[PDB]
Amino acid sequence: YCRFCAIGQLRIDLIDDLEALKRFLSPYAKINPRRITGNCQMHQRHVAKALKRARYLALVPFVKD
Amino acid sequence: EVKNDDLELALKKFKRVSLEIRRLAQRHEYHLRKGMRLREKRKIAQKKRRKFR
Amino acid sequence: IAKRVDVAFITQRWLGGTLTNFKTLSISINKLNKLVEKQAENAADLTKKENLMLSREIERLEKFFGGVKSLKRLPNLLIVDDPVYEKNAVAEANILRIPVVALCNTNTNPELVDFIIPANNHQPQSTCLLMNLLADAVAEAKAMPTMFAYKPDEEIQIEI
Amino acid sequence: NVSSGIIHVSCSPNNTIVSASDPGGNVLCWASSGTMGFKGSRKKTPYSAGIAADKVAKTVKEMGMATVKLFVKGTGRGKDTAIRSFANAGLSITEINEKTPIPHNGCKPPKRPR
Amino acid sequence: RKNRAPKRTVLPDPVFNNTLVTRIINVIMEDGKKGLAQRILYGAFDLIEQRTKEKPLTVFERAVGNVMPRLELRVRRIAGSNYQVPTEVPQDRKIALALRWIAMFARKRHEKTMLEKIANEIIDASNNTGAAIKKKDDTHKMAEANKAFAHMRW
RNA sequence: GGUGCAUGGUUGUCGUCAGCUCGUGUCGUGAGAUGUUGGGUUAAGUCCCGCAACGAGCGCAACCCUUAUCGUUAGUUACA
RNA sequence: UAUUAAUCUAGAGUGUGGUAGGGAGUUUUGGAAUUUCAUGUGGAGCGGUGAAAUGCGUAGAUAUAUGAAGGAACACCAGUGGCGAAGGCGAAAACUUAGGCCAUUACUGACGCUUAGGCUUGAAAGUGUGGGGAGCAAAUAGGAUUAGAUACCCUAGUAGUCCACACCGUAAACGAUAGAUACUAGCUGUCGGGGCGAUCCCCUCGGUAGUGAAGUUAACACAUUAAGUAUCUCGCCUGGGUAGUACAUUCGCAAGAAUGAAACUCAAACGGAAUUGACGGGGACCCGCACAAGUGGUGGAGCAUGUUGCUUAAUUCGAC
């Protein structure tokens, strides 16, 4: 279930589609792999970078809910 | 990793969380290499692509 | 097809070799027919366990020879419902010199059958029509009334 | 003691420790797998951890406690069964947190046991 | 690998009307005879109402009910430090083990004529004084002692 | 008298284990495979479905000896 | 075959529009977590394997919870992966940014490719200098199974591991697959581009992979990225130990490395793959007084039996 090729924005950054980035983020502050997300993986790797930034930005915890 | 559902149901939901943490953090007591880390990442990818698909 | 034109046919397992190897299979089908004839002649001359074993062996031979037991001679021509489904049949036909007619599918290969026909088995509209018309060819060849091959749209035998 | 408090459970491949403590940090009691006649191989089993956890829950119930906080720190296989032992030993549970020394992929660990 | 086989239980002793009676007679078997252990059991009962008086039928059924064990221990080893794992057994082997215990603790003793010693042995095994009840208590207490190794069952 | 480092004849052994195979044929450039393996069943390849397969033999069992119900040939020296 | 001139690009590459990636290096920040430090508590353990042991510990150890210093790398994200000259890259960010991708009609206009020479890099170890040893750990110290054992394991601990100038310029440098050019299905599956639509299920061309047609190979197996198709070029293998030992060239302060022999011997090489078995501290399947149980018997004891080491006038031989 892609959320960036589906939305057609095609623009990935820190804060403009955060809920779309979190759609691939489990409540456990962990991102689902490619075999679970099943998307174009441009947007999924962008999610990877953005949510690792969020962990660095303390949006979501490292090891917590 | 917090789990607060009921007196006992919270632990029932926490069982899977504890299993996940135990399987994730078990690799800090033996020898490992970064190339072997990528190797085992590819191996588990193949495992979940063949079994879990 | 058989009830419209009398002809030897194979419906059970086409054995992995019944045309390139048919000598010890000719003797096998002869043993089967002879044992059935003896059982018709026999009426409980032995213990019933031996009769149970006799029926056991008869059915064992039937479950492999049930298809190939009506012809006593090698065929001069054979049809195929699917080239990949009848690997034994096409193999034994290529060992001989008899041409092959098959209903090729897009997942099959067209370099295996002497008469490639794009007839689907997943879609029954082709296979039913082709079976009926193959029957009708030899029917009109034998000077008997013909059912199909002159209709714009024959019987709709769509499989569920 | 105080009705509140925290029960902490730590596990290493050949050790388990369980301590009932005040919320400020000071402990009220603690036990380990070696406290009984199961030291060694028998102390790597969930039985030793369960009995130690029951012992500390019982001795802190005598010392005075109720529904407790749950702090697990470690990577042991019995880190889930210990919480069940807390729940069934009178020191019931409502929530559980993680104080584990789980390292984000870091430096060299000890040598490989095999 | 053989599996469940048709074990057979013979007709009960038709002078006391109990299958456990004939099983006991055929477990304490000396020289092969049942006319031997039958006399042994009858004289044992006679001396039972002679010393330590008790009705033979009630005391026998009570002993049969009580001296039966609870579980069994299978030996398990992988590399070292072998241990036991609990397992369940049908009651036939339980009463068989009771038979064997009675035979072993009766056929061998000083303290003269066997009549009174076997009567004393069966009476002690009946009134819960330790001759076979201790094994039943231990096998229950054994599971909670080596439970750390008992849990390791596959 | 010996060399079972010639052996025969005879066996034991795995093991009464459920295995050993073979002819028809085909594939693999080749050793090799296939039929037997797997899955069902009395210990049991007693037996069956299946397949590059078809059948057939050896082991095995049903078949043989003893135990064995009734009847049948016939009755003493068993019986009495 | 090669040269001559220019327009055509169509490979060399280039432009416009877009473009994925942990590329690399340098720089910036952060603490989840451990140790020191601070608050404490507490009783008798902690540390850990195959059982345990070395070791820490009543002076307070382990544990218990966070916080400053410290430095390591940054759970999932992590792709039948991307990128990357193989080599290697995973917290996040910035600078240079290499190259990957199409829409590439357009563009100098054969410019091109390999390439011994040469240049560079090639992991990591280790090591010269400046740091921490918080954590790990070679060497080291101890316990432990091997007949010892340095080897499995566990605990600690110096250099070092981690950073920068870096060096050794060596590999299991693996796709065990040298590059560049032109072409070759389908399918399986990860990815990029343009195009047009909700995203997968859309097309095209490519990067990294596989089954597999034709094709190739000794078979295994390559197969659109070939080991194919043909070309071009370079280096190597024309047997193994001999053999990285002889001489000898070169790099290095350091630890050590690149090219490179023989006499002598074997018909072979720890030659390769496939190919039928049993074993496996690899198992699946199928069964047996094969195992438990009691009955016993022997090993414990007496004779009865025959033998064996010994002893005889022979203690007949074999069955081991």
For β-strands D6-12 and D15-21, DSSP reports them as antiparallel
Q: Phi/psi zone of residue C27: left (φ > 0), alpha (ψ -120 to 50 degrees), beta?
A: alpha
Considering only CB atoms, D48 lies closest to which of E81, E148, E152, namely E148
Whole-angstrom distance, CA of residue A59 vs CA of residue C157: 63
Residue C110 DSSP one-character state: T
Q: Please count the other Cβ atoms lying within 10 Å of the Cβ belonging to residue E114.
A: 16
Nucleotides of F under 7 A from a protein CB: 23-26, 46-56, 62-63
User: Does residue E95 contact residue E68 with C-beta atoms inside 8 Å?
Assistant: yes
User: Does residue E71 contact residue E143 with C-beta atoms inside 8 Å?
Assistant: yes
Distance between the alpha carbon (CA) of D104 and the C1' atom of G137, Å: 20
Closest residue in B to D112 (Cα) is B30
Alpha helices in chain B (DSSP H): 9-24, 34-47
User: Does residue C143 contact residue C128 with C-beta atoms inside 8 Å?
Assistant: no
Does E6 reside within a domain? no
Query: At which residue do the structure tokens 């603790």 appear?
Result: E105
Find the helix packing angle between E19-27 and E56-66, rounded to 10°.
80
Whole-angstrom distance, CA of residue E42 vs CA of residue E45: 5
Whole-angstrom distance, CA of residue C67 vs CA of residue C81: 15
Question: Which has the closest alpha carbon to E23: E5, E48, E41?
Answer: E41
Question: Which has the closest alpha carbon to D57: D35, D83, D75?
Answer: D83
List beta partners, residue D72.
D9, D98
Cα D94 from chain centroid? Answer: 16
User: Does residue A32 contact residue A45 with C-beta atoms inside 8 Å?
Assistant: no
Closest residue in E to D48 (Cα) is E148
Here the CATH number for the domain that contains residue E136 is 1.10.455.10
Distance between the alpha carbon (CA) of A41 and the C1' atom of G11, Å: 33
Does E14 reside within a domain? no
Residue A19 CB lies within 7 Å of the nucleic strand G: no
Does E108 reside within a domain? yes
Question: Which has the closest alpha carbon to C118: C67, C82, C75?
Answer: C82
User: Does residue D50 contact residue D78 with C-beta atoms inside 8 Å?
Assistant: yes
Helix (H) or strand (E) holding A36: helix A34-37
Whole-angstrom distance, CA of residue E27 vs CA of residue E67: 16
Closest Cα in chain D, distance from residue A7 (Å): 33
Whole-angstrom distance, CA of residue C29 vs CA of residue C40: 17
Residue A33 CB lies within 7 Å of the nucleic strand G: yes
Closest Cα in chain A, distance from residue D81 (Å): 21
Cα D97 from chain centroid? Answer: 13
Geometric angle at alpha carbon C92, from C88 and C98, rounded to 5°: 130
Residue D90 CB lies within 7 Å of the nucleic strand G: no
Residue numbers in B near A60 (CB within 8 A): none
Angstrom resolution of this structure: 16.0
Cα→Cα distances D29→D69, E99, E124, Å:
15, 51, 47
Whole-angstrom distance, CA of residue D7 vs CA of residue D60: 10
Cβ D75–B31 below 8 Å, yes or no? no
Whole-angstrom distance, CA of residue E124 vs CA of residue E132: 9
Does E10 reside within a domain? no
User: Does residue A63 contact residue A32 with C-beta atoms inside 8 Å?
Assistant: no
Print the SS3 string covering D33-100.
HHHCCCCCHHHHCHHHHHHHHHHHHHHHHHHCCCCEEEEEEECCHHHCHHHHHHHHCCCCECCCEECC
Q: Count of domains in chain E?
A: 1
Does E104 reside within a domain? yes
Whole-angstrom distance, CA of residue E25 vs CA of residue E33: 9
Does E11 reside within a domain? no
For β-strands E83-87 and E72-76, DSSP reports them as antiparallel
Residue C150 DSSP one-character state: S
Whole-angstrom distance, CA of residue E70 vs CA of residue D18: 34
Distance between the alpha carbon (CA) of D89 and the C1' atom of G51, Å: 32
- Scanning D44-83 for CB atoms below 8 A from A yields none
Residue C26 is encoded by which pair of tokens? 């000719």
Residue E104 CB lies within 7 Å of the nucleic strand G: yes
Residues 36-95 of E with CB under 7 A from strand G: 79-81
Residue C5 is encoded by which pair of tokens? 């034109």
Residue C122 makes CB contacts below 8 A (sequence gap 6+) with C105
Q: A40: domain range?
A: 1-65
Distance between the alpha carbon (CA) of C30 and the C1' atom of F23, Å: 17
What order of strands is seen across the sheet that includes strand C100-103? C78-80, C100-103, C115-117
Whole-angstrom distance, CA of residue A7 vs CA of residue A5: 6
- Outline where DSSP puts E strands in A1-65: none
CB-to-strand F contacts below 7 angstroms: C 12-13, 15-18, 20-25, 27-28, 31, 47, 49-50, 53, 56-57, 59-65, 87-88, 91-92, 95
Residue D69 makes CB contacts below 8 A (sequence gap 6+) with D4, D5, D6, D7, D23, D95, D97
Q: Please count the other Cβ atoms lying within 10 Å of the Cβ belonging to residue C56.
A: 10
Distance between the alpha carbon (CA) of E77 and the C1' atom of G119, Å: 65
Geometric angle at alpha carbon E62, from E60 and E68, rounded to 5°: 100
Question: Which has the closest alpha carbon to C61: C108, C106, C27?
Answer: C27
Cβ B1–A63 below 8 Å, yes or no? yes
Residue E144 DSSP one-character state: T
Q: With the C-alpha atoms ordered A50, A53, A59, A65, is the resulting torsion angle positive or negative?
A: positive
Residue A41 is encoded by which pair of tokens? 């993986």
Distance between the alpha carbon (CA) of A7 and the C1' atom of G201, Å: 18
Q: E27: domain range?
A: 19-151
Alpha helices in chain E (DSSP H): 19-27, 34-50, 56-66, 91-107, 114-126, 133-143, 147-150
Q: What is the DSSP string of C62-108?
A: HHHHSSTTS-SS--S-EEES-TTTTHHHHHHHHHSS--EEEE--TTS
Whole-angstrom distance, CA of residue E86 vs CA of residue A11: 64
* Residue E17 burial class via C-beta count within 10 angstroms: exposed 0-12, middle 13-18, buried 19 and up: exposed
Closest Cα in chain B, distance from residue D8 (Å): 15
Q: Count of domains in chain A?
A: 1
The CA radius of gyration of chain A, in Å to the nearest whole number, is 11
List beta partners, residue C101.
C79, C115
Q: With the C-alpha atoms ordered E81, E85, E90, E96, is the resulting torsion angle positive or negative?
A: positive
Any B CB within 8 A of D62 CB: no
- Scanning A1-60 for CB atoms below 8 A from B yields 28, 33, 35
Whole-angstrom distance, CA of residue C5 vs CA of residue C139: 6
Residue A5 DSSP one-character state: T
Considering only CB atoms, D38 lies closest to which of E81, E148, E152, namely E148
Whole-angstrom distance, CA of residue E130 vs CA of residue E146: 23
Q: With the C-alpha atoms ordered C46, C48, C52, C53, is the resulting torsion angle positive or negative?
A: negative
Q: Helix or strand or coil: residue E84?
A: strand
